[PDB]
Amino acid sequence: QPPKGVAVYWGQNSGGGQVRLRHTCDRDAVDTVILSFLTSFPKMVLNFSNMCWQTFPDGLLHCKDIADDIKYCQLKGKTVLLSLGGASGTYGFSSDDEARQFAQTMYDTFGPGHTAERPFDDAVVDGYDFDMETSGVGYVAFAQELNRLHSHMKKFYLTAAPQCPYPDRALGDVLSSAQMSAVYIQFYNNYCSLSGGSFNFATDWKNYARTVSPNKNVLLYIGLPGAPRSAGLGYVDIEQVKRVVGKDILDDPNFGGFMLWDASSAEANKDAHGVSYDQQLKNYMNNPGVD
C-alpha cells in the first residue's frame, strides 16, 4: 500500500540539529515521514523533542507548525504517519475493550474525526505506526479496530516497527493477526543487524510476508540507523548495505525500501561527496548498479 522508497522517523532529534518537518519533506530522498512519538496512551502524551512546546489547557501538545508541515508534506506527495510507543514510552491497555475505545479516540484526535483538542488541528495523518517495544494487552484488538474505523478513508495505513529477531515478542501477534500496510523492521540493537553475520530479512521476514502476514501485499522495509549515534549497534556504511542487500532483495515484490532512525541523523551523516545517508540509500535503490 505505501510508496516504496525511503521512510524516515522524525520528531525525536537523533541528529541533534533537528529542524521543522517541512525541511524533510523537501527532500526527494524521502517518501514517508513518521512522527515520533505518541509516547503514552491511552493517557496520551506527545513528544516531538525540540519542535513543539505549546500545550492545550489539559497539557496535551498543540503543534501548529507540525500541523502545517503535515498538510505541506501531503501536498508534496509524501505519506505522513504517526508512531506510537518508542523505547521510552509508557503505554498499555487494561482490556480489549479499552483498546477498541482508544482506536475511536485516535480516529477523532488524529484521524478524520472531531474532538475539542486535536494536536494537529485540521491536519489528518495518513496512518499509524506501532512502535511498542514491549508486550502488552489488546494490541491485536487495537490494530483491528483502527483498521475498521479508518477503512472508509481513501489512503489509510497501519504499520509496525518490530525489531529484527523473529518472531517479535512485542508485535508478533499484531503482525500475524492484522492487515498491515508495511513493516519497518529494525535491523539494529540486536544480533540480526546487517553487519553481524546473521541478517535475517531474506529468511525469517521474507517467510513472514509469504506465509504469515494476513496482507499478502505487505511491504517490508529494511530499518537502518541514520548515523553511528542513532543506535547502540547496527549502523552500516552504504558499501556494507550493498554487500548484503542485493538484486534478490531489491526486486522482491514485498520489499518496500529502507526505514531510517532518524531524519536529522540520516541528513547530517554525509559522505565525502556531501551526499546524505538517506540520499545514498535512495540513489542505491534507483540505480542499484549490478552487484
Side-chain angles (χ1 to χ4, degrees):
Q1 252 176 298
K4 292 189 200 198
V6 178
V8 305
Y9 286 83
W10 177 98
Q12 289 305 126
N13 187 15
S14 292
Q18 170 182 279
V19 304
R20 276 173 69 142
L21 175 56
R22 57 190 320 116
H23 175 90
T24 294
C25 296
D26 283 340
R27 295 165 60 76
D28 286 326
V30 172
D31 308 294
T32 299
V33 179
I34 310 166
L35 305 174
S36 315
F37 293 104
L38 187 71
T39 48
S40 303
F41 57 88
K43 278 163 281 148
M44 291 192 282
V45 176
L46 287 166
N47 186 318
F48 299 115
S49 166
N50 67 327
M51 284 294 133
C52 177
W53 303 333
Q54 293 194 349
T55 51
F56 291 102
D58 72 355
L60 188 57
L61 282 191
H62 193 193
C63 311
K64 292 179 184 295
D65 292 343
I66 299 180
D68 292 349
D69 298 1
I70 296 173
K71 281 178 294 185
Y72 173 85
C73 294
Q74 284 168 337
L75 185 64
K76 293 301 169 185
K78 312 301 178 175
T79 303
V80 185
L81 306 180
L82 174 67
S83 189
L84 277 72
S88 75
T90 304
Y91 50 77
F93 305 114
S94 53
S95 76
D96 287 4
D97 282 343
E98 179 171 68
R100 280 187 290 255
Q101 293 166 352
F102 180 75
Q104 183 64 57
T105 305
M106 292 297 290
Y107 181 88
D108 288 339
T109 306
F110 294 104
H114 295 90
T115 199
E117 290 184 2
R118 286 184 55 89
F120 306 134
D121 299 305
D122 61 319
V124 178
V125 293
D126 296 304
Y128 310 104
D129 178 65
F130 281 13
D131 193 23
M132 301 86 103
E133 316 271 28
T134 63
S135 280
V137 162
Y139 295 174
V140 170
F142 189 37
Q144 286 168 345
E145 193 64 359
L146 289 168
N147 272 327
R148 194 176 67 66
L149 287 181
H150 291 79
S151 59
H152 307 84
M153 294 173 71
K154 292 181 176 181
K155 162 192 191 67
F156 177 63
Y157 302 118
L158 192 70
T159 69
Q163 298 177 82
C164 50
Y166 189 85
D168 191 80
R169 310 284 157 158
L171 293 174
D173 279 342
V174 173
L175 290 174
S176 67
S177 306
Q179 298 284 327
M180 291 290 108
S181 294
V183 176
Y184 307 110
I185 308 147
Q186 302 184 48
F187 298 95
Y188 50 93
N189 295 335
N190 298 272
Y191 69 98
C192 40
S193 77
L194 273 69
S195 61
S198 302
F199 182 44
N200 63 333
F201 179 98
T203 53
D204 300 325
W205 289 103
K206 198 187 154 200
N207 197 64
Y208 164 71
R210 287 178 170 202
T211 65
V212 179
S213 175
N215 179 20
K216 308 267 184 224
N217 292 310
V218 68
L219 296 176
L220 304 192
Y221 287 73
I222 292 164
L224 292 178
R229 60 177 294 137
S230 300
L233 60 87
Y235 172 75
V236 290
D237 182 65
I238 191 63
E239 285 300 289
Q240 178 57 21
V241 174
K242 290 182 182 155
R243 267 194 288 292
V244 169
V245 178
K247 210 153 187 158
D248 52 303
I249 288 174
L250 283 184
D251 294 348
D252 190 306
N254 297 98
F255 171 65
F258 293 97
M259 173 273 278
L260 287 172
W261 181 265
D262 71 357
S264 50
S265 173
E267 180 176 343
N269 178 17
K270 287 169 162 141
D271 72 13
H273 298 306
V275 177
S276 294
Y277 190 74
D278 53 358
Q279 192 66 64
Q280 288 168 57
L281 286 166
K282 183 72 155 207
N283 292 347
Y284 179 52
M285 276 187 299
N286 291 347
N287 307 292
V290 182
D291 199 327

